[PDB]
Amino acid sequence: MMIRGIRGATTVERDTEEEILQKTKQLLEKIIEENHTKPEDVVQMLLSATPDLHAVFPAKAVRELSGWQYVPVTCMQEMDVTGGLKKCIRVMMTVQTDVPQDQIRHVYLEKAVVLRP
Template sequence: MIRGIRGAATVQQNNEQEIIQATEALLLEMIDLNHVKAEDVTSVLFSTTADLNTVFPAKALRNFDGWEYVPVMCMQEIPVEGSLEKCIRVMMTAETPLSQKEVKHVYQGKATVLRPDLTGK
């Protein structure tokens, strides 16, 4: 079955190194918790808030061995007034035996407020 795996993280500064590090940490946790292999991934979509514009977060995935052929795309999040700032969001679609309820979505940093029902916070 193809499932969506969600993730989000925040950074303190709009700089390439911090964005890449936060995105790598987010992806690694998503991959580890859900036992994802690159060959099972259909695509990965990244979005950022408008205040993050120094690097494409998809660049972080290119640092992972074996992930160079996974299709990725970056876009800007809808600028909703009062929404969480400096946020990177990920939607990974992958083939998995996990049920919808068993999929582990990952929210790090201030992004835990986005889905407290899934993070227990």
């Protein structure tokens, strides 16, 4: 068995609470889907946002997922890089899994499809 990080990234059109939660929830749902993730198997989660989003912590979205109320999560500010993608929310979900590193399904949504390898 092993522990692996799963990466995701999305963008919002405006810095509002609803937009941020909607797009965050959608990101987590797509990750969970592609990686068949169960909440008991999640060690922890880190969420970041670029410094142009202030309306809400994206972690608020985690509590909208049935069964995820005990998954530990905290947020952080993403680096402000010159030319870097605007209004972008990123996740690092750490899970216990037997899926090989090269088979993990990292998720890029909305404008963040540009950051896809």
